Amino acid sequence: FVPWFKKFXERIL
DSSP, X not given: OOOTTTXXXXXXX
């Protein structure tokens, strides 16, 4: 999977 805008959610918490 490539989390393009989804990385922001699963990066800080």
